[PDB]
Symmetry: C2
Subunit: 41 residues, 2 copies
């Protein structure tokens, strides 16, 4: 156990960049739906 | 003040999708730098 810990922090950053991207999309759907609904009345 | 509150929640979702996207990139830089550094030794 010398440089094995790096693989740990690496796996976390992976699920963080992928999980972060998905989270942004969600917020993009709410802002896109609320912005498109505001155009109509 | 009937349908003005919508513009508020809308502005927030905007800075949330843009701020969220930027946050993902950051995590992508740390995972890309840690993954590229692991390939070398």
């Amino acid at each position: 156990a010398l440089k094995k810990h790096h693989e740990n922090e690496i796996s976390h950053h992976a699920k963080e960049i992928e999980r972060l991207q998905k989270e942004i999309e969600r917020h993009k759907q709410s802002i896109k739906k609320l912005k498109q609904s505001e155009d109509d009345d």
